[PDB]
Amino acid sequence: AKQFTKCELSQLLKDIDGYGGIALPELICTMFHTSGYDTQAIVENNESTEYGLFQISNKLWCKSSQVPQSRNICDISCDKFLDDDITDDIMCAKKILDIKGIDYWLAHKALCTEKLEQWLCE
């Protein structure tokens, strides 16, 4: 069981700072409201489920028994987004960022485009 902190998570996504018009602090704001930095956060729905720190949907990004016809773009089983190792979570989130964009996460436009100082980690 692993739960990051704001700055602890920040140093881990350093390669993402400047990744396609994306500021790391805006992305930190995003995950705080998305999962609260919790590697084991999970949201269960009727047809779908969202897994881990990046809340990655089994609809198309990963693979589960719930949605067997998922495209499985990250080419991985969904509950690998529940280990304490987000090394693979980052690899998939990077694909989300590259394909859908940072607004896959609803909280970015709504909350994380201004007042970014609280999410800065220096």
Partner: protein
């Protein structure tokens, strides 16, 4: 004897990690918060606060939800330097749920205890993610839950007044209180909104990043199935607010429980006509 507490509290820490995965022991949160007096009453020993806040919670059979609420809110409310009280208005029976009527009771039942001048009306499953989100009233009616996670952290609509709100005693009296004729889910928040606007008032909100809120994930309820009369009722608030409200509120108090963390008032509020 005691000075006036500042406009802004020094104790505020901002963003708070909210989790619902762990077990909560009401006995422990009590010892966690020793300054909270029997019945869920707290007032600063350091200052005198202008915010005399009665916090009303409409309730039936969500004790596990109530645990988490008290677990997170008491510490927030104390760091906000509020002269507050916690009222859980519990609906006795197995009949259709009436959120707005329970709120009316809470207003009337809290006044018996103390001279409250502000009233936070809060659902039991709504937790704030920032303690800068003030749980007290303003010059205008205050919408506190303005960026809910179930809504993608956006206001679903600009006339939405659901979830958590704050009304001064005079704002609550100007609109004849809340409606008592909305049985079931939905609408009462829209009607209450209509009452305020028709009285010249406007909705005051914190900015999105402050009014953030997590909701405790739960399956819908049979005793609160969606009200099919609501959309017809919302459209005639201007004509019904005078007849239905605080003036036409009746109930029967079955029980009053003074718990360490909250005051629970079990009430018979009747049945739909």
């Amino acid at each position: 004897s005691l000075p006036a507490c500042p406009e802004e509290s020094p104790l505020l820490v901002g963003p708070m990690l909210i989790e619902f995965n762990m077990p909560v022991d009401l006995e422990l949160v009590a010892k966690q918060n020793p300054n909270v007096k029997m019945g869920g009453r707290y007032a600063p020993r350091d200052c005198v606060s202008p915010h005399k806040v009665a916090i009303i919670i409409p309730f039936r059979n969500r004790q596990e939800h109530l645990k988490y609420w008290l677990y997170y809110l008491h510490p927030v409310l104390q760091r906000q330097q509020l002269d507050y009280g916690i009222y859980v208005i519990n609906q006795a029976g197995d009949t259709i749920f009436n959120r707005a009527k329970l709120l009316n009771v809470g207003f009337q039942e809290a006044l018996k205890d103390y001279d409250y001048t502000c009233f936070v009306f809060s659902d039991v499953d709504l937790i704030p993610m920032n303690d800068h989100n003030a749980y007290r009233c303003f010059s205008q009616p205050r919408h506190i839950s303005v960026a809910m996670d179930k809504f993608g952290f956006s206001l679903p609509y600009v006339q939405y007044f659901g979830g958590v709100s704050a009304l001064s005693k005079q704002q609550f009296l100007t609109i004849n209180g809340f409606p008592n004729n909305y049985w079931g889910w939905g609408g009462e928040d829209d009607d209450i909104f209509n009452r305020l606007v028709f009285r010249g008032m406007s909705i005051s909100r914190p900015n999105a990043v402050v009014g953030t809120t997590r909701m405790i994930r739960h399956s819908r309820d049979k005793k609160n199935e969606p009200n099919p009369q609501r959309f017809d009722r919302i459209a005639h608030t201007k004509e019904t607010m005078l007849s239905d409200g605080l003036n036409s509120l009746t109930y029967q108090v079955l029980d009053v429980q003074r718990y360490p963390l909250y005051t629970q008032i079990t009430v018979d509020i009747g049945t739909p006509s």
